[PDB]
Amino acid sequence: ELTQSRVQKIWVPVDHRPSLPRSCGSPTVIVMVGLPARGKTYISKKLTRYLNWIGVPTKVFNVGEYRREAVKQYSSYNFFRPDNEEAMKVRKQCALAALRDVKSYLAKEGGQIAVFDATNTTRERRHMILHFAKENDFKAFFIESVCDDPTVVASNIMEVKISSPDYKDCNSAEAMDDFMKRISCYEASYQPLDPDKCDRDLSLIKVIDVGRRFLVNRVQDHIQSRIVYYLMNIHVQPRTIYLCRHGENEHNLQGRIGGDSGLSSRGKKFASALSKFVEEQNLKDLRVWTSQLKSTIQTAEALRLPYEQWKALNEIDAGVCEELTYEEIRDTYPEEYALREQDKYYYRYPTGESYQDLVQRLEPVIMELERQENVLVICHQAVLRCLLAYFLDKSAEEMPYLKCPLHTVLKLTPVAYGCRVESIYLNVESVCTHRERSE
């Protein structure tokens, strides 16, 4: 005898708890390794953003931030000299303090992956972190980022270093000059991971030649396997992603959800405007993805560009609620209506989906977007929120409420360690969002 949970709709055995109900109440440390300005922090933040979005709780422990709080105002690379005994001691205390927080996150706060982001360039420091992992029952996975192209190091410095709080009192050439001296502090004592000898037994990936060569050693589980796959499909060349919904469609005009209706006459004006907009972006090659529902495909046909249909991009399935208006939902399914409002990410429609299901189904879209250059994705409201949450690092709880009005393009471009979003409304009227009607 089983019962279906109210919110997620999962069949679970009836828990006829005895009259004294009893209640029951292996984590990984990813260790970044590498010289400064090699992308460690960029990898840490973007990996975490991916892991959290697919539902693995992950947190970055950036030792550099523990050092910023402990010292206040960075003045120069002198702080990083190997002969600076006081600073060496502060640096090691910053690392140990970050490790206490790692311990707490993984063993007490429900975290599953802690990304320990520091140079970690000596065997002796990595040996200590492994002792920490062994003593707490954490697994350890090392990601070493290796970069021997001065062009790329210089560009990293310009993109994320010179504008750091460290270089507050500094202009660009002097910041750049200081950082280069900082880097050279680490060179004498740097000991790269060596999987053929001393590091034979560590689980690790070395990212080399600007994400071009990988060495992967002893992947241990499912999550490490996903990490490596991810790291092997990201790249740093700047590009643009555009996201929008299909033009207004006939179910939009009747306030009916889901279905597979066609563009209204304003939806087709949007589709023309979108065509005009794409042309003035003036982009080299632009890939166009749609879902398999009619109104996104009509919208792409207005563009006269080749496009590709993905069933993974189709709107969230409303199950028994498909093609009902919001009032017919409230009046036939008051219980269901109210539960959804209470827990909108986890809620699943009967015989339908939740935002949480959407996430799993969009995972290959996200993986392929990482591999692309310029792409325009024409999709649907919930799909769009779910993709936007991944690029803007929004949590599960905020994802179902992100603003995505009709006839509005979202333009995502890389800056610093993330995505900037610009909204471009294409000046064609539509019925409003459901949120705006309510208030």
Add this chain to the structure above:
Amino acid sequence: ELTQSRVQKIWVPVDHRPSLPRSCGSPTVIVMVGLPARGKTYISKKLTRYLNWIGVPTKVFNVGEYRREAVKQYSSYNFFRPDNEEAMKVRKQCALAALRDVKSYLAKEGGQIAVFDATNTTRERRHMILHFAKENDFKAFFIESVCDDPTVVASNIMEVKISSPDYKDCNSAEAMDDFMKRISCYEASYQPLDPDKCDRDLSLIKVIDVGRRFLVNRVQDHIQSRIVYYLMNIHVQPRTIYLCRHGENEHNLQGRIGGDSGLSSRGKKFASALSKFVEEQNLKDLRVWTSQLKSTIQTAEALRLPYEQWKALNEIDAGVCEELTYEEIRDTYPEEYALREQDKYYYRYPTGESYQDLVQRLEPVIMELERQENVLVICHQAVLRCLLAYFLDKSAEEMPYLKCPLHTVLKLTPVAYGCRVESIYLNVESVCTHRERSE
């Protein structure tokens, strides 16, 4: 203006062909590299089986088979001596003949990946294959399998070599003895791929230390990226996979398709029998996967083992046909009924799925099954056919017709280069398959 295709249900622009209708009517060579008995052929066949099942047409060109047809009866390793000028010449003609067939497969027969399976141990031979790829516009991807553990080489020989047609006239110790001499023929001239120098520019993966270490260089596209991910998640340790359907359920008794009904009283007897059967298999640790539909979960609850629910394992979605009987389908949707019978793999139910959709949605299940040891999967008829087609290398056209009766376990175990299937019927009656009723 768009129209929905009859079979797959894809929105496509009306093709109002002019009165003289005109009709329009980059491939990859995967190059295996390595000493004999290193798993090249096992990798070639299993990669091809994966690629074809996810819908990439792929074919193995095993030069060893071209050599078997050209020479007839292998007598000894003498054939492989580097001083055998006649045999060297035959071997090179076998390779060139396989390359002509590769050319034809990729450029004329619609193939997309040709796996060129031969030792290819010298730079000079790999340079020629690259010339072949460059001259035909094929991309080239190299997979080198490196094995330095005599235990594993010996075991490969026992598992697939001694029983070869080559060793027809031979017993085991002498076959093993001959093969070792064969291997040592290749050692003086063997030149491993070297990505840090001479092979910097090749796209390749070296599989080392029994699938434990990888070196990956210059992945170029989507398909290569999927290959590498796959190769990094397969392993050779023997295990068992069991597949079955849920016990008979109440929609089974009424001949109604889909839905989410519970076990009938015979379904619950099956579930007990399944519990008894699992216990007598006497397996170390056994993972149990179910779908999120009730009757598979009830079936697993009879086992008193921990299980994991996957929404990817849910039955194919019948769309408007959900919960109809086969006669109500025939009588309300005669057009739809008949199309499905005509093209059962590609056919999609209105607002529902096809076997082809099932495949994409099961891809992560297949990837995780590769990583597992002993696993029992309790699922549904179409899901089961789709997984069985992957393990038994059945084509898309045969997949929807594979026999999967109720109350029957399929036990899959590794032999030689594939999976043996044994059927174990657990002696509990159920309504019959729909195929059996019809005839």
